A paper describes a structure:
Bacterial substrate-binding proteins (SBPs) belong to the widespread ABC superfamily and specifically have a role in sequestering various metabolites, including amino acids, nucleic acids, carbohydrates and metals. All SBPs follow an evolution­arily conserved c-clamp architecture containing α/β globular lobe domains connected by a backbone and interdomain β-strand hinges. Recently, we determined the crystal structure of holo YfeA, a Yersinia pestis polyspecific cluster A-I SBP, and reported a method for purifying apo YfeA in the presence of the Yfe transporter by fractionation, adding an additional strategy for the production of apo SBP proteins. In this report, we solved the crystal structure of apo YfeA as well as that of holo YfeA that was reconstituted by soaking crystals of apo YfeA with zinc.
A possible explanation for the improvement might be that gentle pipetting better preserved the sphero­plasts, reducing inadvertent rupture of the inner membrane and contamination of the periplasm with cytoplasmic contents, including metals that can reintegrate with a potentially apo YfeA. These changes enabled the purification and crystallization of seemingly apo YfeA protein exhibiting relatively low EDS signals [Fig. 1(a)]. Diffraction-quality apo native YfeA crystals were observed to crystallize in the orthorhombic space group P212121 and had unit-cell parameters a = 40, b = 52, c = 113 Å, which are 2 Å smaller in the a dimension than the unit-cell parameters of the His-tagged holo YfeA crystal form 1. Apo YfeA contains 111 disordered protein atoms in a mobile helix and a 94.0 Å2 metal-binding site. The missing amino-acid residues constitute the base of the flexible helix 7 and the subsequent loop that have been proposed to undergo structural rearrangement during metal transfer. Close inspection of the changes in site 1 between the apo and the reconstituted holo forms identifies the key change that triggers the spontaneous refolding of the mobile helix in the flexible lobe and closure of the c-clamp. In the apo structure, the site 1 residue Glu207 is completely disengaged and a placeholder water molecule is observed to coordinate the nearby residue Glu256 and to establish tetrahedral coordination of a site 1 water molecule [Fig. 3(a)]. In this conformation, the site 1 residues His76, His141 and Asp282 remain grouped together as an electrostatic touch fastener primed to mate with a metal atom. In the apo state, YfeA has three grouped (His76/His141/Asp282) site 1 metal-binding residues linked to a rigid amino-terminal domain lobe that serve as an electrostatic attractant for metal ions. A fourth, disengaged site 1 residue (Glu207) is linked to a flexible carboxy-terminal domain lobe containing 111 disordered protein atoms from a mobile helix.
Author numbering: 40 to 225, 239 to 311
Amino acid sequence: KKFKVVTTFTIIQDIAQNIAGDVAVVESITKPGAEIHDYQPTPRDIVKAQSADLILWNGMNLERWFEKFFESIKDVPSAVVTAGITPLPIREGPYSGIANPHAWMSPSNALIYIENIRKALVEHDPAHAETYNRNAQAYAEKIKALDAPLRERLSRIPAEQRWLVTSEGAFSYLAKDYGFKEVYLWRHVIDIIRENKIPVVFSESTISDKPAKQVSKETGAQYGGVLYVDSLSGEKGPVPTYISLINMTVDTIAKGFGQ
């Protein structure tokens, strides 16, 4: 029998499947592309999680539905994969002061995701500890190697122009790592764009693109479209892995800035 792991969403699924390798099967509760914050689980989502040996979740109140969901599950252990991360506060807007849950968009934070998943797997499936530890070591080397080329590419964007328009803080951890300022959009966004001649504006995927488009139209900044960071694609889609999500997000940002 294969140890069965269930995760709340696809980013954790991919990180955990690299650590589990061949000795455990990792499934996500939510399909690729699903809205993760207020997902509404079905009765069969609960039954699927009930068949697992371990449930992994992000915490930091990413999954507002998880506490109720988990209360419906009997005697399946869970582990929060962000234990030990320094949470960034949402700096402005209606959620000012609250922990920003999007911690996976910092590649350094992904090393802590890996460590917590490895620990939980080794705790609950000790027979396979050697495999989990080896796989976590090998995958962590891949993740450490992510940061250098991304940092170098984004560092060519002059610091004066290094701004991201944010609505729910989906990019705040990437912005912290690579030195981007953030201006919140619930217009005073227009002024900051014009003042610093920020060349491009992106939209978050959990909100309407209309206000970001209005900002672009009025300032003359290019509208670079939507940046999706809450989900992977399917296996055969263009964003099948956590590594591909990080690399593609930075490439889209950098290209928006002519870099």
